[PDB]
């Protein structure tokens, strides 16, 4: 087991990930990220070649979604079913209608006796953490109000690593440059991915209108993670209020929603980007990326959404398997 | 592989052709495709009635998206997927606006088709099913939309008719099927679709309705065109009646429609439309002995509960056949390949 | 071959009889059927606790119809079907009127039973479950209705009790089980059902409640009838208290219920000091204030193990009804 040049003791890394809950991207260390990226890649090649994907039969999951996040739940359902496991769904409720005046702690204590594991999406931060205390079974956070959404960060990173596999090397001479564009204050997907990218030799352009810029505590985390690996310089983090400057010499453009224009991506705005630049967007989009860009080979936001299948399959496999691993 | 012992079906050849086909409209199904669907449906009927292994399509994952309540049809599709041995993730109890939370139909289907092998889609918007078909990298089966397209209802209607009157398939000038369509023929879109499919064959139509609620001109033109193309059109091909006793005379099939009170000016005008076209053992005495009664269901007042005991009634077998026809269609479309030995027998 | 500590079970014979049986009411389950359910539940308990293969009923497709929210009970049934290796399609987030949309219960179940092997049905209407049973060509398991029939709740309550007090099965005059039912005994239908089942055995009942909320007369009569039939009825068979101190004295089981104000009957470590060493605490759940969170630590509490046993009991019942094996060799046997 290799990613061209890093040997993965997938056995050793699984013994450690077995029955781990994944709430925040900080719950995933370097070795765990390598295992997730290696395994995701195998599910990518197995599904693209129409091979048997059933590496985790015999599990029964509960999926609890206490806000509409139909794309994210469908992605998790598809991953569970494609692995050959089974799922029981709780949807089209909110927190108050589901906890009909019963405690979160009682609910998860009981529900964890029925299933092998739980996919949980709830806009309350409090609730996911109470669920983790009370559950006898691993929980995968599918998203909460504090902007923790680890499978989104993991599929974002997997997507970037497919075009720029040198992000993993921590080589001083091989730096990745990313522009984050739009609502960086409220775009929590940016906060999570920034935290993960700063573990590596990465340089950040935060492109926003003053009012909606990256929060100070996220810039502190980036600075801390860059200093720890001796990749911090005065050039590590730049701030722009316009695309022309922001999109210059960046390998990745990561677009977000801007609710309430200067931050609209078009084929025109993409002319003075590198030949190799790739465009991510966690989706859904509104106006932020013009439909014309879909034809531009730099666009990968739809491949990005697709990779979420492979990354969620990988993570379920590595956590819930009771080991013959996926290969080729 | 034969049907009626007349027509040999190259199920391999026909599968290679149907593989990953979307089915939106009954015109997406040709003669050979219909024969393959009828043959395969029949095998699933005999396999399930004899409690044998039904698992002819195991390794597939479907998404079922129903953006209006159509619980019988959704359950029928779920059951077909699950009985074949495949798996399904469901979207129900949403409408168009709550599901497309201001995201484009194009974007939504582009993403969702990366997660699954196939999509079952029901949406009252016709626009939406067509956009879904353009954007989806995977086959779509229309489970029903606003323009009255509902091809699996047409297919199970036809399968049901062909079980009692297998000569509809022969296109023989001397072996004509006579069907009476009864009730709200303006709004009974199930009639429009089945008419279109029956007119491909040697068939004669009684449209039994009252004034306001007759079969639309565009459907009559389609029937006329399809009958002329197979040299089965005469002055007798299409008759119109405003009452049962004339309408039900010398017809092999009676197809009753839903009559929703929602469709009149008041509850008055609705109750005098029921009564006029309500089916009873009395109204059925001067029908042929071989007459069979279909109804797409639900039945409310259109057919009296006493008729359920009448051996002419098949509307419950009809609903049941939807399982076997949806299993057949999924098998033929979503098998990754076919071998001689792998088809239902 | 199949033994229940010391009772030999002809699981083949009992299955040939239970095959395609509907289970609406706890009285649809006789002595032999209860022994089979307890034996089979126990196997699923040991198989799942040891992460062994649980797939003793693959190849089945169920419909689960829940025409009121009862999310815990629906999840429990879904989990049981999926763990057995079968498949289920769901009808939820509907009520009676939105699902029937003025089509008959009889037509709906006639059609739906052509699609599936079996139906799990929860509906507040009692009329509806009975019409569903007439119309369905396939077995129905009642998951709950308004007349308080909920047989899998009675069965998992009983399974839980039998795990700590296996002598309830012996019908031995010298080995009597004493249970206190606490709270809203008028409206706590789970009490009515369990009482009916426990009274088939050598059992003594403390009904602890106020005045407005006492056990109804007709349930006391059923208990008296079932106790008299097995020569276990005395003037001491049924006692009535309005306070915990007296109610909880010398009882092997405390079964708590919801007391919804539309104070006095709250279980704490203090109220549990004058119970037997061996007493176990059940509660069908959910709880509100009836049991203080401190009691969860008290080894006498088993209400969470109780809810867990619902998985193993619902797996057992689905297996025993819907299995189409022949061989004695194919039954669970840990
Ligand atoms: N209805 C928005 C949407 C898009 C994609 C998916 Cl997978 C699900 C829902
Ligand atoms: N009523 C909230 C709840 C739902 C499911 C389960 Cl299993 C437990 C409690
Ligand atoms: Na499902």
Numbering used by the authors:
A (entry chain A): 39 to 298, 312 to 374, 379 to 383
B (entry chain B): 38 to 382
C (entry chain C): 38 to 299, 312 to 383
From the manuscript:
Aspartate transcarbamoylase (ATC) catalyzes the second step of de novo pyrimidine synthesis, combining l-aspartate (l-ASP) and carbamoyl phosphate (CP) to form carbamoyl-aspartate (CP-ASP) and phosphate. In depth structural analysis of the ATC catalytic cycle has been performed previously, which indicated that ATC exists in a low substrate affinity “T” state and a high substrate affinity “R” state. Here, we describe a series of small-molecule inhibitors of P. falciparum ATC with low nanomolar binding affinities that selectively bind to a previously unreported allosteric pocket, thereby inhibiting ATC activation.
Fragments A, B, C, and D bind in a buried hydrophobic cavity formed by the α3 helix, α4 helix, and β1–3 sheets of the adjacent subunit. In the citrate-PfATC complex, both Ser135 and Lys138 from 120 s loop form polar contacts with phosphate (which represents the product of PfATC) to support the 120 s loop in the closed position, whereas in the Fragment A:PfATC complex, Ser135 and Lys138 adopt an open conformation, forming a hydrophobic region buried under the 120 s loop that accommodates Fragment A. The 120 s loop of the citrate-bound PfATC showed a significant shift compared to the Fragment A-bound structure between the α-carbons of Ser135 in the two structures (7.8 Å). Further analysis revealed that the amino group of Fragment A forms polar contact with Phe136 and a water-mediated bridge with the main chain of Ser107. The main aromatic ring faces the Arg109-Glu140 pair, with which the fragment forms a cation−π interaction. Fragment A blocks the motion of the 120 s loop and holds PfATC in its T-state—preventing the movement of the Asp domain and CP domain toward each other to form the carbamoyl aspartate and phosphate. However, stabilizing effects of Fragment A were confirmed by DSF experiments.
